[PDB]
Structure formats: C-alpha cells, structure tokens
Amino acid sequence: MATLKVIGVGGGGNNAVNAMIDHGMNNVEFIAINTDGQALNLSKAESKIQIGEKLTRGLGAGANPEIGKKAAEESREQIEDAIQGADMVFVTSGMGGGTGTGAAPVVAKIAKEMGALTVGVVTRPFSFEGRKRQTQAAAGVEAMKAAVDTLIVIPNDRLLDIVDKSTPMMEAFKEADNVLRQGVQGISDLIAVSGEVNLDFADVKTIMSNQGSALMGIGVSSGENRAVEAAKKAISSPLLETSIVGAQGVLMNITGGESLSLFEAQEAADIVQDAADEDVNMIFGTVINPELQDEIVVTVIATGF
Ligand SMILES: Nc1nc2c(ncn2[C@@H]2O[C@H](COP(=O)(O)OP(=O)(O)O)[C@@H](O)[C@H]2O)c(=O)[nH]1
C-alpha cells in the first residue's frame, strides 16, 4: 500500500491543503511549508516546516522567488526528513508569489531525488492579480516542469468559466482550493480508493515519470451514452490549456455508483484513444463511489508531450 504525501508550499498551497483536510482526503499525509512563521501557525497539517528561518527571520519572502528558493535550499535536510518514506509526493502551490514560486521547485526536486513519484499540482494567478504575478508565475511553472515527474497546471482564470456570475473574489479563491483538492484526489484515486489498490503503481509511475507538463481533465455525464459523454467532456474540460491530441501515455479512471461493466469503461476509453491521433500506452481502471446515482465520472491524465 503506497505511502502518499501532500505538501503545500506557500500561503495559497497551504490554504488548499487545509481544504483537502477539512473535506477528508484519507490515506495520505499532509505537510505545510512556508517562510512566513505566522501564516505557518494557522495551517492544519500535522507536519509543518518553516523554511529559511536564518535568511528571512521568519517574515516571509515578500513576493521574491529568489528568496523562496534560497529558503528551501537552506532548509533542505528538514524537508527531506519530512518526506522520507513516501512512495509518491504531491507538491501543491499557487504560482506567482515568492515562497511557492521559488521553494516549490526545490521541494519537488528533493522528493524526486528520494525516488518518490513527484506530482506538481499548481495554479496560475487570476488576471486581477496583475501582469507581474503572471510573469513570475510563468517562470515558476517552467522551473516546476523540470523539478517534478508530472506537472498539472490549472489556470485560475478558467475557474470563472464554471462558477456563477455572482461569485465574489473570496469565493473564487475557495474554488481554487477545491480544484487543487480535486486534482490531487483524482490522481490519488488512480493509485488507491477506499484503501484498495486501483491501477498498478509501477505502471502509473512508468507513465507519469520524467514527463514534465501533462494534461488532466475530469468529465461527468448521465443517462444514455454517459460513458462516451463523460469522456468527451474530460478531454475538452474548461481547465485544459492544450488538447490531448498526440499524447503517448494515458491514465484513465472511470467511477460509477455501482461496479461498472468493462464494456462501458472501454467505450469511454475508445473516445480518449481516438482523440489522441497517435497510438497510446493507455491504462484504465474502474472504481465505485456509492454516493453517485446515474452519473459516471471520467478522469484522464495524458502525458508524452
Ligand atoms: N488556492 C488558493 N490560491 C491562493 C490563495 N491566496 C492566493 N492564492 C494564489 O496563490 C498565489 C501565490 O500567492 P501566495 O501563495 O500567497 O504567495 P507565497 O506564499 O509567497 O507563495 C497567488 O498569486 C494566488 O493566485 C488561496 O487562499 N487559495
């Protein structure tokens, strides 16, 4: 049974990890990382690492990624001790500030160099945060690409396509927390659900390793043609920056409220295989979530770009 750990890096990442904890992701261990001592005290993770004590004197990184980077490097041993034993590590962070932008790539490289399957799940800032955050965030994503095995980037501006028009700013960040939770949960569910192995870990690791940027989409449908419709939605999800056309590796999970037939799963898989336009190493699993009625959920991770 794989040891999964989820690490928040910086304020946005730790706020997302707090939402993961509240909501009850089970069978994973949570860690929070920050340069800002006071922000770090409000985090709900049982393992907390204040990085760059000497450098920052605990006062944060002031939106400077070079400071977040040197803080994580200063604290490398402590981060490694907190990671030791993980088979898989998620690094979650909002790109664009100092700590997550700078430290999250150091943290990822540390995990990867312990042999863990290292998955980044990160956001690009909303446009209201300004062109400067957006620029810093883009350098952050480029550094994260090299540091992880697989990177999932979610643009926060795309969240606005799937929330009510009346959504205030505070709720839009709560939505950002929820999407990071869903991306982490959805990838976690490829490994194990309800404490039971789903896809073979070694084969997941093979597909997700040393890939850099990858693509993740989740789609939902019901009634007639539900499997195919859910699959089409997954691969055209509003959160996707690219299409899956070309992908050399695909991991797929299909979730229903009763054990799904292989036939039906395979119809959804055929949509994803076709849309690829090239011949994939594709692996899929099926899971049961009792709370579902007639809805099927299709989760797709595509890599090899
Ligand atoms: N998910 C989430 N993202 C946030 C929140 N607050 C800010 N962000 C995003 O995270 C980015 C980095 O800010 P922050 O995490 O505060 O900076 P850092 O602590 O220096 O990395 C921001 O540009 C926002 O896009 C939040 O509460 N939740």
Side-chain angles (χ1 to χ4, degrees):
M1 208 70 192
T3 306
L4 303 190
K5 299 197 174 179
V6 178
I7 310 178
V9 188
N14 296 330
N15 286 356
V17 164
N18 291 337
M20 283 170 219
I21 295 169
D22 292 5
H23 177 98
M25 304 210 320
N26 287 25
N27 304 321
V28 308
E29 292 176 77
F30 302 99
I31 297 159
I33 291 178
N34 217 324
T35 48
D36 188 282
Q38 189 194 343
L40 194 53
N41 278 101
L42 266 70
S43 295
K44 282 168 243 193
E46 294 165 51
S47 186
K48 294 174 176 272
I49 314 171
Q50 173 171 345
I51 57 165
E53 289 178 324
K54 289 190 76 65
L55 184 71
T56 74
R57 282 305 205 81
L59 307 194
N64 193 323
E66 295 288 2
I67 299 185
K69 177 167 190 286
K70 290 163 209 215
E73 293 160 336
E74 162 180 337
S75 298
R76 176 177 243 288
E77 302 271 332
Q78 289 68 43
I79 294 161
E80 287 172 333
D81 297 332
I83 297 170
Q84 202 175 320
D87 302 296
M88 191 183 189
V89 172
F90 292 89
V91 177
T92 190
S93 197
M95 297 291 95
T99 298
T101 305
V106 176
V107 169
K109 187 176 200 277
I110 294 162
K112 193 207 259 165
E113 293 177 1
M114 297 179 99
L117 178 53
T118 301
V119 178
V121 191
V122 302
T123 60
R124 295 177 198 278
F126 290 97
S127 280
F128 61 79
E129 305 185 58
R131 295 221 177 269
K132 157 181 199 294
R133 305 292 277 205
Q134 197 68 38
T135 297
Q136 266 183 5
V141 168
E142 294 302 313
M144 280 296 282
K145 277 173 201 180
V148 303
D149 286 302
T150 284
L151 184 67
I152 302 309
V153 185
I154 297 142
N156 282 340
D157 275 348
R158 267 50 276 166
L159 301 178
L160 310 176
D161 299 353
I162 64 173
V163 296
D164 288 358
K165 168 161 144 192
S166 67
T167 305
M169 193 183 283
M170 187 185 66
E171 272 70 14
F173 282 116
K174 289 190 207 189
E175 204 68 38
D177 304 329
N178 190 56
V179 181
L180 286 165
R181 178 184 68 75
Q182 294 164 320
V184 176
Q185 185 61 254
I187 297 170
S188 288
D189 294 345
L190 302 163
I191 304 311
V193 171
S194 310
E196 294 265 33
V197 169
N198 179 12
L199 299 193
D200 176 74
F201 188 67
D203 291 354
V204 172
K205 193 171 192 180
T206 299
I207 283 163
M208 291 184 84
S209 74
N210 189 52
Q211 290 297 320
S213 274
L215 179 158
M216 182 177 183
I218 306 184
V220 188
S221 198
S222 58
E224 288 280 26
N225 287 17
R226 58 179 194 160
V228 163
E229 275 168 7
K232 280 166 168 163
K233 286 175 192 176
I235 63 166
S236 61
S237 156
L239 306 177
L240 295 181
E241 285 166 343
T242 324
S243 88
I244 63 150
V245 174
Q248 303 294 328
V250 174
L251 296 167
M252 193 165 176
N253 205 28
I254 312 180
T255 308
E258 289 164 350
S259 72
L260 299 167
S261 81
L262 261 182
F263 190 79
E264 208 189 351
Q266 184 69 57
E267 288 191 287
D270 288 346
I271 289 309
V272 176
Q273 180 54 64
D274 292 15
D277 220 336
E278 300 209 90
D279 199 58
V280 196
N281 181 24
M282 185 165 323
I283 300 179
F284 70 82
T286 68
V287 172
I288 300 157
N289 173 344
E291 189 163 16
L292 306 191
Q293 297 188 329
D294 197 69
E295 63 273 63
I296 200 172
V297 182
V298 172
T299 304
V300 179
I301 294 174
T303 65
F305 302 115

